[PDB]
Amino acid sequence: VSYPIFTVRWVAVHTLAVPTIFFLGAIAAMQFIQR
Amino acid sequence: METITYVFIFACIIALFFFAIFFREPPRITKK
Amino acid sequence: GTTGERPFSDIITSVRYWVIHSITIPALFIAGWLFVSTGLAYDVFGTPRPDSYYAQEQRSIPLVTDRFEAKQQVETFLEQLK
Amino acid sequence: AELTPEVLTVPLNSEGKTITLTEKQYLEGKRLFQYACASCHVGGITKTNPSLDLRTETLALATPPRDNIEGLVDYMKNPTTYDGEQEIAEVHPSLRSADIFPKMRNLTEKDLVAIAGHILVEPKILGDKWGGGKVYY
Amino acid sequence: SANLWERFCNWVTSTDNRLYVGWFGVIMIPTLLAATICFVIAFIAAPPVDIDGIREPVSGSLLYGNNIITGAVVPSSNAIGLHFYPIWEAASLDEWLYNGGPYQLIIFHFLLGASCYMGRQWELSYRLGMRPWICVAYSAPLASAFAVFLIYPIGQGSFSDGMPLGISGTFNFMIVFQAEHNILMHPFHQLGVAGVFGGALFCAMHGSLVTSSLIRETTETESANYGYKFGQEEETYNIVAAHGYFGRLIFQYASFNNSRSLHFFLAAWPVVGVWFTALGISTMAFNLNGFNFNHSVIDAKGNVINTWADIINRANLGMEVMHERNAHNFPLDLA
Amino acid sequence: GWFDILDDWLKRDRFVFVGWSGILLFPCAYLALGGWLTGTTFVTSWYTHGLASSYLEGCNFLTVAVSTPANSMGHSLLLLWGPEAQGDFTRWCQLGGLWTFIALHGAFGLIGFMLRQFEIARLVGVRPYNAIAFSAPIAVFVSVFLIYPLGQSSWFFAPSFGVAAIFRFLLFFQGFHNWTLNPFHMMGVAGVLGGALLCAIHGATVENTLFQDGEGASTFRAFNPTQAEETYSMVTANRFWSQIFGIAFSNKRWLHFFMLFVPVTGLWMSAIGVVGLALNLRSYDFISQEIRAAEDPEFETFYTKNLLLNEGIRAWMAPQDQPHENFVFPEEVLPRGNAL
Amino acid sequence: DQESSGFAWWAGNARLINLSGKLLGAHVAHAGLIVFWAGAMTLFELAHFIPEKPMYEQGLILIPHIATLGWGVGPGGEVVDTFPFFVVGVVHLISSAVLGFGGVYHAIRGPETLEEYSSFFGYDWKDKNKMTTILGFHLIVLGIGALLLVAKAMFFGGLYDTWAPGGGDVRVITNPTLDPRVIFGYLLKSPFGGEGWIVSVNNLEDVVGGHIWIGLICIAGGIWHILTTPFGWARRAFIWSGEAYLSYSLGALSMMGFIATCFVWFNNTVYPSEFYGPTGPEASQAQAMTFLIRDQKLGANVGSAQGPTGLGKYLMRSPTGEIIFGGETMRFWDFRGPWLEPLRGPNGLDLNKIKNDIQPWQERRAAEYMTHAPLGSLNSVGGVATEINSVNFVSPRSWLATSHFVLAFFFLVGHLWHAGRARAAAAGFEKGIDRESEPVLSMPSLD
Ligand code: CLA
Ligand code: CLA
Ligand code: CLA
Ligand code: CLA
Ligand code: CLA
Ligand code: CLA
Ligand SMILES: CC1=C(/C=C/C(C)=C/C=C/C(C)=C/C=C/C=C(C)/C=C/C=C(C)/C=C/C2=C(C)CCCC2(C)C)C(C)(C)CCC1
Ligand SMILES: CC1=C(/C=C/C(C)=C/C=C/C(C)=C/C=C/C=C(C)/C=C/C=C(C)/C=C/C2=C(C)CCCC2(C)C)C(C)(C)CCC1
Ligand code: OEX
Ligand SMILES: [Cl-]
Ligand SMILES: [Fe+2]
């Protein structure tokens, strides 16, 4: 079949995927903070 | 008075248990 | 049992996907990392740094005590080098 | 709100003279305090004798005075009762009893000074917490 | 007579009994009857019990000032500990009732019978040619009773610390437990509520989905239940219409279409979750408690920055500090 | 008409069904989950509770939380553009603005979600017994996260969104409300525990009364997705439980409705009890018990024991749990048993 | 060879029920994993091991197992030479490669079945003769092993005896209790408070002696099963299938798993408090000791001291009259220990020995065990759930006991599961009720 690319599913998936990794990167950096 | 009331209800539940088990509606197959 | 969307299996398997996402996925990661490591996150959410919970001597808590003049009261708490 | 060298300035001896520890000594002391003290002296108390704590004030009214580096260090070698009228090295960890308390074998004079410093720095930071027990947890 | 014993074995094993008294039943029925009779009599008329062995009798029976909610059967004395205390171990019944004698008689008989009850749930399944493993599902609630009535007392070194047989007495067991073990901060317990919440969730899930996708065979003013006859050939609900709905609620592949894969999950989730919660009490019976994040996060100077974990600790202290007033003589609670 | 064209698009069968409900559901639901995940990692609770509550401060998955606003706020909606935050975002965060954000948004998210159930059911043409059931989780959220603090002094005494922050909410209700002694709560657990039993027992019953529809041992494949005959022997199941338990089902339609009733009814009862706790109309005591306990120093029940535990909880927790009260409890006034 | 047309993927290992060859590879590859762990872990423990520091404060569970056998230790459990630890570790780790080799080989190269490639090693589950024979083989192998312990104890060095006359030390046992009345007496002992059944063993003489009996009896039954077949009843009672045999061994391990849990938690002898931590009762006993010691030095008369309840602050009586420690520790009046026994008299704790025979080594022993009770958190924070972070510690007795209970339990489930299937497999309905011939439909209605 000739499937499309940008779809409603694509949008949804990205609304969760994009912030997640951005957070996973942020939290990963926190593991080195100290005092 | 209170003790009596508590045991009474309890005795009533146990009585129910009996009738529920041995005096139920016979579960009939297909032709029901 | 099917709809318009392109079967995930194909996409997660397609070389084109990875050619894209080998760039995109790490990019967001490094971005989130920088968001913290540059101390920006601290200012965006007013979260105190390890050396910004109390004043040097003070051992009291900066508890907000009134709703309307809260924002003003909060700023006053940052004043005392907190 | 940080561990300044202003905080790490603790009395060295009875004659008012003081000493200034370093963030390296503190951490090292804190670690050593966990290694050979925390077992019974967790959070400045004394599990096997709650009547005597590690409060600076309590150490001050000790006999001899144990509210300074020199005091504590001596104690860690030859410990005594609160009046000092009796040596208790046999039932208390010390250098002259390292055969009985293996943990004290490794410990060298550098370690002793660090541990001593830790006991004096903690109340400066924690305050009432360091002295009291579950009440202040 | 073909043979008395042979007939006897045939009556026991008989699948034509109203209640299947099995071989496990031969042990179950007497033990359960002893347990329940002693319980009922105790709960009503038993005298106060010195649970903590400190000569401080706790009355938990109706006739002695209690009601259903407060009333309970008080655990054996702490002076007895893990010692075996049958009736024939006491100078008199008066002494036996004072030292929490009934408690042991009940829990031992119950746990024994309740175990045989599981064994019977296999036997009947065997005699009826159906698959076993139903008893395996019952192993989870049973393992909890075992953990609460036997494992924890063994670990703690006394039956006086086993869960009391009553409403309020059960609340006491929990509050104190939380203080000494911080059970809320333990993974196994968390898995427990996960199974229990999930259970109730899924029970409502399945329940609703099925009953909502019933094939119409009833009148507008007639009970929708009558649209089913005991002993049907075909199904009474459209599982394909059910899957169609739930498949659209979330998304297709996150929805069941296999009734067998469904009911397995329906059974697996709660049983496994409760299994862990049973292992939780059994693990914390040897003082392997929940996470201790007290005074974890501290600031740059060393000051203690509190968390919700600390707020929990304060509540825990209050329970610890106040439980069993006159029972303690020494600083540490190690027993 | 544009409407029916808008409808057409929305009600299109996609991978993730949108629908009219989706216009309400997805925005809120996403912001609610997002707001939590945001605060969980970044925003603090220092200025509101004197607490660290984020990964950024050092909290872990258990100790993290989106804490309630200060008691000063009252029942304020705490709008970003409201008199408190005054458009400021950073201030808004520090005043616990994210709590009312998550709460109110999530609340509408639960409204949209049930609407989705209603909307999808109608389309598929199935009965809305999935929407009726979902009312129980609604009542709980409404009663606990909204109604309860609305009866108290402020949002501050509502359950904070977080693992540990919920555990103290439990212990609080014990210490202060004696929540376990409440009949409505008892019905609650009776429904959940009994519901978690029905779930277990029914699944196990079915899997172990199945017919043989295949030649393999893994009987999972041997199921007919297209209805036809019953996949498990309902008749055998009946006789089983009738002999081991004495009572047994014999009407799948009732059995499954029962699986709906029990857990939904329970949560509803637990809701009412909480609604009463808002006005502090709790089930704390038994007057008959206290009166004898006063006159008679030798009368002791497991009920009296528990109340002593409550006094300890209240006394030792209140100071750091209610900062706004500036509590100061001298060591000598703290209720304590012996030695401990 | 084997795929979906036999079992499901998540039940894969059940496809090997009738593949003796490959089914041997598994057991040999698996056995390598056990040797691998034992080896690699010992070296891991040693690599972190600190000599001048208690073993229980270092999270050791294998090195203290070696210490018990009299290896690398001396007076009072003092660690002398760490070489035997290193050896036991590396030797195992090596043997894991050897076993692992055969495991891999038999599972992917060697004959997929054994019956043809060797009629001696090949077997049939229903072959009651081969089964009891293979069982007979292992019954001897285990039997010799039981004597391997006896040898180490009597000849090759001995064991660590905490009850040692001059104080805990490695002692050569040269007088094993062989009296059957005494030995088998333990089996007739109660499992409750006081009479402690098997766990109540309190001297190495019985330990070594008991193992002598077990060693002989095991090999004796080993020979018996080689040269025989199951009787009449033995055949009409059990189920004879590959799964059935598994189930029997599953419940067996489960039972042993529970016994081991109570052993490491209660027993003092075969689990030395010098290498492991102090047992639960021991630590609570120590606290009573400690403060009895303290306050007495302050001039308090412990004998007549009256506590809050009026029961006896420091000393009270047991239900049978013996003088015991006071407080909540009344539940642990069944505790026996080297440090405490010299204070005990013919009627329990002697007030005279308590008054002036208290030794310094006992006071600090009590203090030690008191501040090292088996109390801790999952994240390893020693003390009560309300304690503060500082002392990173959780008694090895706690780790072992909890771990082995979970395993023991799940194995009891594994038992029920595999025994329930075997009964249904044999009779032949483990795959569903026969649609045609439905048994229930042939039984009269009880209604
Ligand atoms: C449909 C989805 C939806 C819904 C129902 C809500 C609902 C809400 N949001 Mg919200 N939000 C959404 C999507 C949604 N949001 C999205 C997608 C975002 C991301 C941009 C946000 C971001 C967001 C933030 C950042 C905040 C909210 C907040 C709020 C709450 C208060 C807002 C308020 O006062 O409403 C006002 C209601 C209206 C404006 C509706 C008016 C409709 C009429 C018909 C239009 C009339 C206009 C006309 C000029 C009037 C003329 C009259 C004349 C006299 C002048 C409320 C629960 C606040 C909150 O949670 O506080 C704690 C808050 O601070 N929202
Ligand atoms: C001596 C021990 C032993 C042996 C030899 C077997 C042998 C067998 N079992 Mg088994 N079983 C045992 C103990 C044992 N069992 C115990 C104690 C239980 C109770 C839990 C079970 C429960 C059980 C079930 C429920 C089933 C079997 C089945 C089987 C058969 C197929 C094997 C299989 O499914 O592998 C497949 C193996 C897996 C899918 C791996 C499972 C992984 C586990 C669940 C997780 C372990 C957690 C781990 C410690 C954490 C690691 C962390 C991770 C991040 C790395 C096979 C004959 C199956 C069968 O066909 O029955 C005859 C079957 O359905 N067993
Ligand atoms: C103790 C763990 C263990 C062991 C020993 C085995 C052993 C076995 N399984 Mg198995 N299995 C296990 C766990 C285990 N399983 C678990 C947990 C699951 C669930 C996921 C399964 C699921 C499963 C299925 C579904 C099947 C098996 C099968 C088999 C058998 C054939 C293996 C095969 O196909 O080779 C294939 C081998 C390879 C593809 C290469 C793997 C590389 C090797 C084996 C490992 C090397 C080890 C090490 C790194 C090398 C050291 C070398 C050194 C000594 C020099 C074999 C006896 C099959 C069977 O029934 O046999 C016909 C089969 O169909 N298993
Ligand atoms: C089973 C026996 C056993 C026992 C009693 C111990 C005991 C110990 N180990 Mg150890 N270990 C074991 C097996 C065991 N280990 C194995 C098999 C391995 C190989 C992976 C290791 C590897 C290992 C290392 C690398 C280290 C230890 C350490 C330690 C010590 C510290 C304990 C700790 O912090 O763990 C805490 C561990 C946990 C809290 C994890 C609990 C995991 C549970 C069991 C998961 C259960 C979930 C369940 C399976 C989910 C399945 C359900 C699903 C199917 C639905 C302690 C003495 C440490 C040490 O010596 O330092 C002092 C250390 O560094 N162990
Ligand atoms: C559970 C253990 C076990 C068992 C039952 C078998 C069984 C078998 N193996 Mg074998 N094997 C094993 C472990 C085992 N293996 C290990 C660990 C390895 C890796 C080194 C191998 C490597 C291996 C190879 C490479 C081959 C076999 C083969 C065979 C088969 C032919 C018999 C044979 O070679 O023996 C012949 C040897 C003897 C009869 C005598 C050996 C005695 C040894 C030297 C002493 C063992 C001492 C022992 C540890 C202590 C016991 C004494 C105690 C009672 C006091 C047979 C089915 C062959 C095969 O596939 O043929 C079908 C084959 O080519 N095996
Ligand atoms: C683990 C090793 C092992 C295993 C698996 C077996 C397995 C078997 N043996 Mg056995 N045996 C062994 C070791 C072993 N033996 C040893 C070491 C000896 C030497 C003493 C013997 C001597 C022996 C004889 C003399 C006979 C067997 C027989 C049998 C077979 C039937 C067993 C049976 O029906 O018992 C079922 C047991 C009962 C119905 C009795 C139950 C009552 C028990 C004992 C008491 C309650 C147990 C309780 C829960 C545990 C508490 C402990 C207790 C001390 C208080 C079976 C294949 C018989 C056979 O068929 O001959 C080939 C037979 O006549 N065995
Ligand atoms: C607030 C706010 C907002 C919002 C925002 C958002 C919306 C965000 C989002 C966010 C997000 C959305 C985030 C996410 C995150 C995520 C994460 C971070 C995750 C993680 C994960 C993990 C970690 C995992 C884990 C696991 C599990 C769970 C299971 C098992 C396994 C594992 C381990 C894997 C706005 C702007 C509108 C406005 C203003 C305010
Ligand atoms: C069958 C199968 C399987 C399994 C497998 C197995 C189980 C294996 C095993 C394996 C093994 C079991 C292996 C072993 C190995 C070992 C080794 C190889 C060793 C080595 C050693 C050495 C080398 C030593 C040396 C040393 C020393 C002495 C010290 C120092 C250091 C060192 C370490 C170096 C699986 C599941 C996967 C899959 C399916 C099939
Ligand atoms: O009992 Mn109930 O409470 Ca388990 O802990 Mn110790 O003993 Mn008593 O004290 Mn706490
Ligand atoms: Cl209490
Ligand atoms: Fe169902």
Any idea which residue has 């109730």 for tokens? E200
| Residues E169, E165: Cα–Cα separation, whole Å | 7
Cβ neighbour number for residue D31 with a 10 Å cutoff: 13
Question: How many structural domains is chain C composed of?
Answer: 1
E303 and chain C: CB distance < 8 Å anywhere? yes
Strand partners, G315: G325
| Residues D24, E36: Cα–Cα separation, whole Å | 67
Which pair of tokens denotes residue F217? Answer: 């041992």
Q: Is residue F12 part of a domain?
A: no
**Which atom of ligand 6 lies at the shortest distance from residue G139's CA?**
2
Q: Are E171 and F180 in contact (CB under 8 A)?
A: yes
| Residues F291, G409: Cα–Cα separation, whole Å | 48
E322 and chain D: CB distance < 8 Å anywhere? no
CA of D76 to the centre of ligand 10 (A): 42
CA G87 to chain centre: 23
| Residues E258, E268: Cα–Cα separation, whole Å | 15
Which pair of tokens denotes residue G200? Answer: 């109540």
| Residues G372, G364: Cα–Cα separation, whole Å | 12
Mutation test of the interface with chain F: which of G440, G445, G446, choosing the one with the most F Cβ atoms within 10 A?
A: G440
Helices (H), G177-275: 180-183, 204-226, 233-237, 242-266
- Sequence letter at residue F125: G
CB pairs under 8 A between B and E: 23
**Which atom of ligand 1 lies at the shortest distance from residue F79's CA?**
61
SS (H, E, C) chain A: CCCCCCCHHHHHHHHHHHHHHHHHHHHHHHCCCCC
CA of E219 to the centre of ligand 11 (A): 24
Query: Are D and C neighbours with ≥3 CB pairs closer than 8 A?
Result: yes
| Residues D51, G167: Cα–Cα separation, whole Å | 32
| Residues F273, F143: Cα–Cα separation, whole Å | 9
Rounded to a whole number, what is the distance in Å from the CA of E300 to chain A's nearest CA?
A: 5
| Residues F227, E237: Cα–Cα separation, whole Å | 8
Could you give the C-alpha distances from E303 to C56, C60, D32, F5, F165, in angstroms and in order?
Answer: 10, 11, 20, 63, 22
G52 and chain D: CB distance < 8 Å anywhere? yes
Q: Are D114 and D32 in contact (CB under 8 A)?
A: yes
Cis peptide before D64 (omega within 30 of 0): yes
What string of DSSP letters covers F188-245?
HHHHHHHHHHHHHHHHHHHHTSBB--SSSS-TTTT--SS--B-SB-HHHHHHHHHHHT
Q: Are D54 and D120 in contact (CB under 8 A)?
A: no
Q: Is residue F5 part of a domain?
A: no
Which residue segment(s) compose the domain that F218 sits in? 22-340
Q: Which of F41, G364, F295, D50 is nearest to C47 (CA)?
A: F41
Nearest ligand by distance to the CA of G102: 5
The three-state secondary structure class of G16 is helix
Q: Which of E187, G12, G207 is nearest to G3 (CA)?
A: G12
CA of G132 to the centre of ligand 3 (A): 28
Choose the closest CB to C5 out of A9, A22, A23. Answer: A9
CA of G265 to the centre of ligand 5 (A): 40
Mutation test of the interface with chain B: which of F238, F243, F250, choosing the one with the most B Cβ atoms within 10 A?
A: F250
The three-state secondary structure class of E24 is coil
CA of F28 to the centre of ligand 7 (A): 15
- Sequence letter at residue F180: T
Q: Which residues in chain F have Cβ-Cβ distances shorter than 8 Å to G429?
A: 212
The three-state secondary structure class of C49 is coil
Mutation test of the interface with chain C: which of A2, A33, A34, choosing the one with the most C Cβ atoms within 10 A?
A: A33
E300 and chain C: CB distance < 8 Å anywhere? yes
Q: What is the DSSP letter of D51?
A: T
Could you give the C-alpha distances from F32 to F39, F99, F186, in angstroms and in order?
Answer: 11, 10, 31
A13 and chain C: CB distance < 8 Å anywhere? no
Q: Is residue F4 part of a domain?
A: no
Cβ neighbour number for residue D8 with a 10 Å cutoff: 18
Could you give the C-alpha distances from F334 to E114, E333, F329, in angstroms and in order?
Answer: 45, 19, 7
Longest dimension (CA), chain A: 58
Q: Which of F239, F206, C1, G429 is nearest to E235 (CA)?
A: F206
Q: Which C residues in the span 33-62 are in contact with A, Cβ-Cβ below 8 Å?
A: 33-37, 41, 50-51
Q: Is residue C1 part of a domain?
A: no
Question: How many structural domains is chain F composed of?
Answer: 1
Question: In sequence order, what are the residues at sequence separation of 6 or more whose Cβ sits closer than 8 angstroms to the Cβ of residue G169?
Answer: G74, G75, G76, G160, G161
| Residues G117, G110: Cα–Cα separation, whole Å | 10
Whether B30 and E62 lie within 8 Å, measured CB to CB: no
C6 and chain A: CB distance < 8 Å anywhere? yes
Cβ neighbour number for residue G13 with a 10 Å cutoff: 11
- Sequence letter at residue G369: Y
| Residues G387, D133: Cα–Cα separation, whole Å | 10
Q: Are F75 and F67 in contact (CB under 8 A)?
A: no
Whether D48 and G371 lie within 8 Å, measured CB to CB: yes
Question: In sequence order, what are the residues at sequence separation of 6 or more whose Cβ sits closer than 8 angstroms to the Cβ of residue E278?
Answer: E140, E143, E144, E146, E147, G409
The dihedral region occupied by G287, where left means phi > 0, alpha psi between -120 and 50, and beta the remainder, is alpha
Any idea which residue has 């703290």 for tokens? F334
Which residue segment(s) compose the domain that D8 sits in? 2-137
Instruction: For G60-109, list the strands marked E by DSSP.
Output: none
Longest dimension (CA), chain E: 92
Q: Is residue C51 part of a domain?
A: yes
**Which atom of ligand 8 lies at the shortest distance from residue G29's CA?**
7
| Residues C74, C71: Cα–Cα separation, whole Å | 5
Q: Is residue F46 part of a domain?
A: yes
Q: In this structure, what is the dihedral angle of CA atoms F63, F64, F68, F71, given to the nearest 10 degrees? A: 50
| Residues E122, G416: Cα–Cα separation, whole Å | 9
Q: Is residue C74 part of a domain?
A: yes
CB pairs under 8 A between E and G: 212
| Residues E264, E134: Cα–Cα separation, whole Å | 11
Which chains lie within 8 Å of chain D at 3 or more CB pairs, if any?
A: C, E, F, G
Q: Is residue F7 part of a domain?
A: no
| Residues E287, G279: Cα–Cα separation, whole Å | 12
Query: For residue C19, what is the domain's CATH number?
Result: 1.20.5.860
Q: Are E103 and E75 in contact (CB under 8 A)?
A: yes
Rounded to a whole number, what is the distance in Å from the CA of C52 to chain E's nearest CA?
A: 8
Question: In sequence order, what are the residues at sequence separation of 6 or more whose Cβ sits closer than 8 angstroms to the Cβ of residue F21?
Answer: F112, F113, F115, F116, F118, F119
Q: Which of E65, E279, E81, E59 is nearest to E169 (CA)?
A: E59
| Residues G244, E289: Cα–Cα separation, whole Å | 38
Q: Are B7 and E44 in contact (CB under 8 A)?
A: yes
| Residues B3, G175: Cα–Cα separation, whole Å | 66
The pocket around ligand 8, CB under 6 angstroms, is made up of G 25, 29-30, 32-33, 36, 90, 93-94, 96-97, 100, 103-104, 107
Q: Which E residues in the span 257-296 are in contact with G, Cβ-Cβ below 8 Å?
A: 275, 278-279, 282-283, 286-296
Which chains lie within 8 Å of chain B at 3 or more CB pairs, if any?
A: E, F, G
Any idea which residue has 């075992």 for tokens? E146
Which chains lie within 8 Å of chain C at 3 or more CB pairs, if any?
A: A, D, E, F
What's the CATH architecture for E187-316?
Up-down Bundle (1.20)
| Residues G354, G363: Cα–Cα separation, whole Å | 11
Counted residue by residue, chain G has a size of 447
Could you give the C-alpha distances from D47 to E322, F272, G292, in angstroms and in order?
Answer: 20, 47, 14
G330 and chain E: CB distance < 8 Å anywhere? yes
Q: Which of C67, C53, C59, C55 is nearest to F95 (CA)?
A: C67
Q: Which of F194, F275, F170, F334 is nearest to E171 (CA)?
A: F170
Q: Number of C-alpha atoms within 13 angstroms, CB side, residue E255? A: 20
Q: Which residues in chain C have Cβ-Cβ distances shorter than 8 Å to A10?
A: 5
For residue C37, say whether it is annotated as part of any ligand binding site.
no
Any idea which residue has 């008409």 for tokens? F1
The three-state secondary structure class of E308 is helix
Counted residue by residue, chain B has a size of 32
Known binding residues of F for chlorophyll a are 105, 185
The three-state secondary structure class of E90 is coil
Identify the closest residue of chain C to F15 by CA–CA distance.
Answer: C3
Whether D1 and C59 lie within 8 Å, measured CB to CB: no
Nearest ligand by distance to the CA of G86: 8
| Residues G173, G154: Cα–Cα separation, whole Å | 5
Question: In sequence order, what are the residues at sequence separation of 6 or more whose Cβ sits closer than 8 angstroms to the Cβ of residue E225?
Answer: F251, F253, F254, F257
Domains and CATH numbers, chain G: 1-277+374-447 (no CATH), 278-373 (1.10.10.670)
Q: Are G382 and E260 in contact (CB under 8 A)?
A: no
Which residue segment(s) compose the domain that C15 sits in? 6-82
Q: Which residues in chain E have Cβ-Cβ distances shorter than 8 Å to G255?
A: none
Q: Are G221 and G368 in contact (CB under 8 A)?
A: no
State phi, psi for G203 to the nearest 5 degrees: -160, 145
Could you give the C-alpha distances from G383 to D128, D137, E287, E290, in angstroms and in order?
Answer: 21, 14, 9, 12
The three-state secondary structure class of G189 is coil
Q: Whose CA is nearest to atom 34 of ligand 8?
A: G90
Q: Is residue F3 part of a domain?
A: no
Q: What is the DSSP letter of G159?
A: E
The pocket around ligand 2, CB under 6 angstroms, is made up of G 10-14, 246, 250, 410-411, 413-414, 417, 421
**Which atom of ligand 7 lies at the shortest distance from residue A16's CA?**
12
Which pair of tokens denotes residue E60? Answer: 């938990």
Could you give the C-alpha distances from E266 to A26, E259, G432, in angstroms and in order?
Answer: 38, 10, 19
| Residues G47, G29: Cα–Cα separation, whole Å | 27
